[PDB]
Paper text:
NRP1 and NRP2 are histone H2A-H2B interacting proteins, closely related to animal SET/TAF-1β and are involved in functions such as histone chaperoning, protein phosphatase 2A (PP2A) inhibition, cell cycle regulation, root meristem formation, heat tolerance, protection of cells from DNA damage during genotoxic stresses, and nucleosome assembly activity in vitro. Here we report the crystal structure of AtNRP2, which reveals a fold similar to that of NAP family proteins, with minor differences as compared to AtNRP1 and SET/TAF-1β. Interestingly, we find that binding affinity to histone H2A-H2B is significantly higher for AtNRP2 than for AtNRP1. We also show that both AtNRP1 and AtNRP2 are capable of nucleosome assembly activity in vitro and thus act as histone chaperones.
Based on this prediction and further alignment with the sequences of AtNRP1 and HsSET/TAF-1β for which crystal structures are known, we decided to truncate the first 13 residues from the N-terminus and 35 residues from the C-terminus of AtNRP2. AtNRP2 NT/CT was heated at 40 °C for 10 min and centrifuged at 13,000× g for 20 min at room temperature before crystallization screening. However, we were able to solve the structure of AtNRP2 NT/CT to a resolution of 3.42 Å in the space group H32 by molecular replacement (MR) method. The overall structure of AtNRP2 revealed an ellipsoid homodimer with a pseudo-two-fold axis, running perpendicular to the long dimerization helix, giving it an earmuff shape. Each monomer could be divided into two domains similar to ScNAP1 and AtNRP1; domain I, which is the dimerization domain and domain II which is the histone-interacting domain. The domain I consist of long antiparallel α-helices of the two monomers arranged in a “tram-track” fashion, which is the characteristic feature of all the NAP family proteins. The dome-shaped structure of AtNRP2 shows an uneven distribution of charge, where the concave face is more acidic in comparison to the convex face of the dimer. The offset in the dimerization domain leads to differences in the end-to-end distance of the curved cleft, and thus AtNRP2 is more curved than AtNRP1. AtNRP2 forms a tetramer assembly with its nearest neighbor. The underside of the earmuff domain is thought to contribute to histone interaction, and as the same region is blocked in the tetramer conformation, it appears that the tetramer assembly (if any) would occlude histone-binding or could probably be a means to regulate histone interaction.
Author numbering:
A (entry chain A): 22 to 155, 181 to 186, 198 to 221
B (entry chain B): 20 to 142, 147 to 156, 180 to 185, 199 to 221
The structure:
Amino acid sequence: ELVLSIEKLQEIQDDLEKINEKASDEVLEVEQKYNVIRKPVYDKRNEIIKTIPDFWLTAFLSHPALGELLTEEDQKIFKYLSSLDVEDAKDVKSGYSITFSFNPNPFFEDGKLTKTFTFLEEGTTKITATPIKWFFTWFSMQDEQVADIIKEDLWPNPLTYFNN
Amino acid sequence: DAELVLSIEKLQEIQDDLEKINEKASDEVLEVEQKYNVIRKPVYDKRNEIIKTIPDFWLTAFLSHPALGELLTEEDQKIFKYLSSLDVEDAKDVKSGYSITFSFNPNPFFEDGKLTKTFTFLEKITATPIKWKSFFTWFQDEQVADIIKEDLWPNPLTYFNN
């Protein structure tokens, strides 16, 4: 009468979803191995960064999007930051954290400030950050954007934005 | 400046290393794609079987899709009414390119049974010429091919049920 072959096609689509999930799992395994491979070279690059004074402030101010978020007083405060680290979860799908380490600096009583993102299986995310012991109010909503851009755009190659 | 340099250059070296590493990683990812495209070849083919039973399936999918709904003119809809099946094939590798093949039934408009539009990645778009008798102007804008490949292809039911 009425073709339920649409339901048979729904079955085929759900079947292909399993192959897609397995391929995603293998891609995640590749990225898991390579983040472990990349941890030493990033840890060594931060040593080079420490030699360059206010490297991260220059990189951020040179970046257009985050450079809009300068908040010049918060920019003078961000000049103080000792280093910047971005850690991915052991299982790369769960989440990640971004940690700004500040050597002893006024305007902030906390040495290190980090924002952690945990990914729920539905798709929504939970963003929780270290409390401030006081612009740069990103540690307290809009989207992953900031926590996103630094991870994708600035963290791998900050040098592209440094010399501009 | 005298010293501030060497440091920078060292970092450049470090950055280059990352690139190399990333390249290696990327390679493996691509391989997985290859590995699973073969795995997907039967189902997709098998999927086409079901599609042959549904009347005016791919036309309804093109129309229901918000992006490709407005691309089809009335003449293009009438031409789509005839098509038998649709196929999309990645290359033997994955970074080389892909082709989109419209297998159309005998039509009064055009004699050609199947039309293949192939994009190749040089690190090149070529179409089988129609034999006559706005979207169909396909045989710079490859998007019309990317949105078909990435969104509609894998799951046309994403915007279906109309």
